[PDB]
Symmetry: D4
Subunit: 210 residues, 8 copies
């Protein structure tokens, strides 16, 4: 019975050293050391760990100690997302979908599906971005966009709720109502959505005053 | 007892002939004969009757059977208003004050005071007219304007309550509120105020169109 | 001064005998005598009296003691409506618009215009009639129909308010609101709309509880 | 002295090796290796651990690397539930109650009791499932079913609140209300109940459309 | 010509003497003389007049100067009701239906029908009495009773709306709702329905703070 | 039949001459002649007419053409109120209850009873006056005062509704509620009440910085 | 140098053996072994650990494997509460306040103070218990009792909100409101207050049923 | 591989001994030993650890075992804040900015910026304190103050709710609403904001009802 024991202990040692390298790295990043943080996260992600791959991608696309790169960054994000990390797949989808390119390529469908199943978890940013993405060409699906924008806005995001308000006012996906749109704009401006909410409130409060 | 009896009976004869002539006149006007109605109303008003003076002024200012005249119309309206006919004094004030002339003369102040007294009697039009009046130079009194505009709007006038809404959104006399103004615009659209809705709803919907 | 006096007294005699004929006819109708009511109303309406012509038309189109007739009834209703009687012109439009024939004749436009400027006075039935009429071909004007149906239903008519409810539910002229339509149906059935509100409640109950 | 120390250290060693094997197994399952995860979970559950027994039951009922089995799955689920694991006992009850068999067998009595005391903890799924279960024969207990459906739907489940709405509409256990039921259907369709709420909305649409 | 004119003038004289006799009767009743009121009203009702018959019935059933008599009052109310007097027919129905007898006698059929078509006119008391009567054996029609109780209570009658509240809380005709019944009792106490509303509030306080 | 006929015709002559005297009095008062109006009103009121006695009391207590007198005024008001005139008895209460004397004299009880049966008719001012009166010593009856203040304020009187607000905030007769009291103050001051505005702005607006 | 190191390592060893014994003990209790759990918890609490002392108190007051004792239970609870354990101090206060003895003994003063500062943390049970406690003699402090009952019931406790409802009806510490109290009773019965809310609903049912 | 391994293991040892020293420090603080807690926290913070520095600052500024000092306290707070400790950076900002001096010194700008980015994290006290901060000279920026007071009051802080109410009633930053301000006062007094809310309720009670 010692063979399974030794296999178990060596696999546990592998996993534990991965954990320790990741924890070290994040402690260095929080403390202030960065190049050592990059080295630690790279050598931790080289051996198949989820959070390590996420942080490697995060530091390698923010470039907090390495020139700004996206290719290897999104490769790390893919490798982390395949293992079931919510933030990793959110970042992967947001980085791959930043272009206005068409959705004919299958990797776009894969990215939007993984972002969808990420937003199913409950992360605030993923579902808000999904609601934004499904509202614009060529991902037009008004009902799902509305429902996820509303669900994200219920968590307290000002911009998502302003987008819900413009969705009501423009009358796409939801019946064209104006009073709820006005109160939504007012509360979004109250919650400190400076640019868009302030601009729309000022326009509506000046069109009849100028 | 014969002297008081004969005085009473002759005064009754005067009042009865006044009533009969006014009646006849209004029956002729309703039936379709007009010049006879004019003559009847003039000879009824020449002998001191309130409603007869109102009808004479009305038929002189609309001119529905006599060339348009404002001088005699306004004089007859003055005679009718001095005796306590609410609609007559409303018409007097509206016809005399329709000019954009200054209110330095006290006679205009007398006209606006009698308009106030007429509106205090419950007439729908006088209240709305003074609500419009007090918002324009030099009759600036915002609180009274708002209160009587609201009182007239409670009777169901679309224009008066649209002016209440414009007052809310512009924030004069009342704290500057937008949601109540929007619902007021919407309900004024519901009652069919063409000039109000067909401009305000279009201006608040032009923002939706891109 | 005798010529104007004699003309005035003979006009007064004419109008007063018309009044007497009308009053005696309506008293006979209320008491129970009917053929005398026809005779009196006809001889009163033959000499140019508004309410007398209304009653003549009413007794000719209900036929409460004379065979049912339309041509004489509609002619009397036209003659009475020309003189400014709200009920007269309401009944004229009711009896003229009841046919399913084409509206190429301008008399139909005249009838709808007089119905409109009748219902603008405040009569309950004319408003509901025009609200129904403008909803059907070829008088399609959704906004006016909705507004007058609403201000008619505000007076407490169950059928007009049920028609407002179906207007909301079907989403013609107003945005397709559904909860308001359900509440309107329910409180129409509360006021005793025996047929319509009850049958929609039953249809949405039996076909909803399965 | 030393005897209690050695007993404590050996018991701690047994517990720690159980913990390590469970952690290993779940790390392998998350990473992607499966058969090793099955072996690890099996040998961890063979020595009396709660979460390990739950994971063994889960991997035997989904069969993500082992032929589908319910017998061993439910045995492991029972062994995990007896030790106080909320999600495991929820799974046990939902697996044992999937059959349409009667509740004469007292194993069903313990199953429903353990599901009840699991839902008392606050898990979303168990409460909704029991709310569904108590509605159908022979578990009829309307008040408790409605209360647990309501408090489960308060957590944001679309199907639970849709079933609350159908409970309102059919009026079983709750006073028959219809407007709030319609609002509940509408919001559940808004929250993304793609099948059921949308189907009832369409039914209430085509009910009057055709 | 002569014959129709003389018939018209003699019928007018009959009507005018009836009017005068009724006017003297009501003037005497208001002034304070009562036996002359009985004489005038009796001789006025003896010649076929509506409100004269109503007043004769009123003075016979109150006996404001004549021994209490119901048979003559009931006959006079019948004569007044047959001629189309809303208040008189309401009085007839309420006087005839005071007995707890069944509705097998068709006299009760006419009584209830005329009370129905009187309450349809807009009188306050008739509606409330019908709402009460349809609630009690053998006139049980819950929906009609509820709808007239509500319509009468809308006019501001305190006792009718207290009956509406008792009907709602007892759950006949309308489903059992409690909060609305609670502030229905509260407003009925506020509007001065001292007896019933005070009793219900006192009971609801004694059984609560016991 | 000559005796009853002559009695009827002479009584009709008495009533008709009273009506004529009152009509000439009111026509002269409206026209502008005052002493003749006084003479006619006294000679009409001396011979048993209700409205004439009201007008005589009114012209004696305002003194619009005769030196101020209260004795004759209140005597005429008593005679007019004994016959069932709402305004007459309300003015009797006006002129009698103004004294700060005690209510030991039963004539005060008669005055308040006639005021009660006046307010039961539906006049606006009498109810507001009794609502003020029952609040102050020794007429303390809080419930009735509140109920009739509320019912009168429902008619739109600003002072009565401000008194309703003071009653709410002070917590006499009603539960001491502040939010409804603040609102009530707000719309009372909105309708142009000097006292309500001067109380609100000095209590809940000045106390902030004073 | 080495001296501080050896002191630190020996103190860490004491703390770690305490932690391990506590963890062991709770693992044995959850697994099913009890007397070993008692021994482990006893020897862990004998050396000054907070959670171990709480568990010792719990196992001495429930007696799930040791004869029931309150003396040692409350002594352990005090020793755990002095170190800052919220649930332990809640248990101490609830065990010491179960007697109906007076608060003359200052041990009750510390007990109530520690319960207060425990409830200040946010535990549901302690706040509800103090809300119950301050209502009854001699701990009468109505405002604080109501506020803590309200904020505890906001967490979803049925009995706490039922006691809030009673507080509303009896009107102690809060302005006596009845409609909101009825709604609170109804919702608490809906949330599953099987005994008390249902009993009051039945009482308010049979109060009018019989 | 020896050099990277030895560097990793030595860095891990340094971090682990820092963790252990902090753990024994907090264990001593909770147990009751204080001077040892001070020594351990100081030697842990001397080697660069975040929450150890926070605890050192806390023990120097409360002085729970050392004479009161702010200098070393704020230096340790700066060291902890620079490393990303939300609560520590709150404490640093609040301790540095307690002085009433101006914001000319850049250290105040740094403190307010770090407090801003602390409040943006989600800490309850930071947002409330910053809402208070921006209200007073020279940090006047009303919108941010209003939004942070609103968000903090949404978390249940009574004083923040009172300051929101004072902001509404005083009409700075938000429109001068008074009704919802009174409701805010009342329901903040319900939560137990004894001093200020009780003071305002007493001022609005004595000045109004006395």
């Amino acid at each position: 019975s010692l063979e399974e024991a030794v296999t178990s202990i060596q696999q546990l040692f592998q996993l534990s050293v991965s954990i320790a390298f990741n924890f070290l790295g994040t402690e260095n990043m929080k403390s202030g050391d960065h190049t050592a943080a990059f080295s630690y996260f790279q050598k931790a992600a080289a051996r198949g760990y989820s959070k390590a791959q996420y942080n490697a991608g995060l530091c390698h696309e923010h470039g907090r100690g390495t020139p700004r790169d996206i290719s290897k960054a999104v490769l790390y994000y893919q490798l982390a997302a395949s293992q079931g990390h919510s933030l990793a797949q959110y970042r992967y989808a947001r980085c791959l979908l930043r272009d206005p390119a068409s959705s004919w390529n299958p990797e776009r469908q894969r990215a939007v599906s993984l972002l969808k199943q990420a937003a199913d978890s409950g992360l605030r940013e993923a579902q808000a971005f999904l609601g934004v993405l499904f509202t614009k060409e060529p991902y037009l699906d008004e009902q799902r966009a509305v429902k996820y924008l509303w669900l994200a806005a219920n968590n307290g995001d000002s911009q998502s709720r302003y987008h819900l308000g413009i969705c009501y006012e423009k009358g796409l996906g939801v019946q064209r109502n104006l009073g709820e749109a006005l109160r939504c704009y007012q509360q979004s401006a109250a919650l400190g959505n400076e640019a868009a909410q302030e601009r729309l409130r000022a326009l509506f409060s000046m069109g009849a005053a100028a």
